[PDB]
Design a protein around this nucleic acid. Structure first.
Ligand SMILES: [Mg+2]
Ligand SMILES: [Mg+2]
Length: 171
RNA sequence: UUCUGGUGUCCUAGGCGUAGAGGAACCACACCAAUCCAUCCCGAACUUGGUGGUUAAACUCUACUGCGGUGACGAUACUGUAGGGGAGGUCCUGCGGAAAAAUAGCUCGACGCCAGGA
């Protein structure tokens, strides 16, 4: 019912709770979410403009922020592309948007996925960061995407402990 | 004369890593706000204006020779010069010069200026 749940629930309840878990000598050693990078790659984006200009608006309503036409780092003929042409669709979420986006993730989009049985807890990279893959975006109440969550954690255990508190149903 | 910060020159370039110290002041980060300004998206960075929590990260100081960097003397190779062998490939001698490599060893910088503090 409150305005910002995660921002208030984190600073008040989680930081005293997560500090007691690992017994950090300082409060600043606690991890926290830095950003959420939402990628959406389309190889055939160079062909059409309607499918490009439309999908850019689809993600914007999901995030409340414009995507960015991500360009190629180098040309290659195996996938018939050229340098400087747009291939990916990306955006950066920081501050309150990443929390508001996470509220729309665990409670709106992630439950509505067909045949849902929890997300893989082995998706951590080994340095506290976490990633998610989608096939559809209509689960958001308004094609796939690679949501990349960043965190200041060194190991994955405190991250798994961190993410699990803010929902994130793991099998 | 020392401590902190700022700013340099010299230099064998003085770093990585490990183990400690620092918060009064100083430096830094963290927290909040956003139309002077900014984002091929995002107040992260950049810019204003605020709260002072923390030395966690950075940075500063103290130590070492584990990596790294540095590095001989001596000897030998090579070589100038005057000569001499061998069918040739190439080799030897006298006078003079003289390494690289490796090892020992050295190395966790040296010296200034301004402000503040003692
Ligand atoms: Mg010698
Ligand atoms: Mg040598």
């Amino acid at each position: 019912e409150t305005i910002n749940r995660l921002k208030t629930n984190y600073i008040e309840k989680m930081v005293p709770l997560l500090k007691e878990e690992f017994s950090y000598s300082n409060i600043l050693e606690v991890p926290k979410v830095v950003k959420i990078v939402v990628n959406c790659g389309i190889g055939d984006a160079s062909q059409n403009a309607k499918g490009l200009d439309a999908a850019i608006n689809e993600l914007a309503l999901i995030t409340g922020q414009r995507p960015v036409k991500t360009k190629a780092k180098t040309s290659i003929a195996g996938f018939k592309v050229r340098e400087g042409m747009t291939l990916g669709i990306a955006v950066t979420l920081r501050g309150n948007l990443m929390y508001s986006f996470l509220d729309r993730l665990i409670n709106l989009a992630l439950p509505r996925t067909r045949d849902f049985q929890g997300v893989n807890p082995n998706s951590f990279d080994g340095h506290g960061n976490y990633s998610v893959g989608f096939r559809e975006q209509s689960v958001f109440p308004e094609r796939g995407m690679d949501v990349c969550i960043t965190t200041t954690a060194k190991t994955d255990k405190e991250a798994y402990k961190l993410l699990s508190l803010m929902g994130m149903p793991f099998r």
